[PDB]
Amino acid sequence: PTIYHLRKKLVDSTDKADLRLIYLALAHMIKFRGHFLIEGDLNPDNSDVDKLFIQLVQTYNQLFE
């Protein structure tokens, strides 16, 4: 129904899909790339505020007694 279904499908599955669909996904990504405001790369960690915030509190507690 959307392009993101094909996106998620091609991202997860490692099966040989049609070349036109692969082209559509890649060209759609290029046509709407995103901002370059954040330097480096954000590898998908916990992806939740809770876990990383707990880690933050852990670092703050071990840093300052």
Place this chain on the structure above:
DNA sequence: ATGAGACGCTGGCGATTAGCTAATCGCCAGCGTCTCATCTTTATGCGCC
């Protein structure tokens, strides 16, 4: 040694037939961001030919 010259309802209707700018007012107008640097310039504050 005879046989030409002298020429109409229109105007006033209807009724087709055909064709055209203009005056009044309302609507409604591509726009969204960020980064980066870059220079200026201003308010105040300090010096005598």
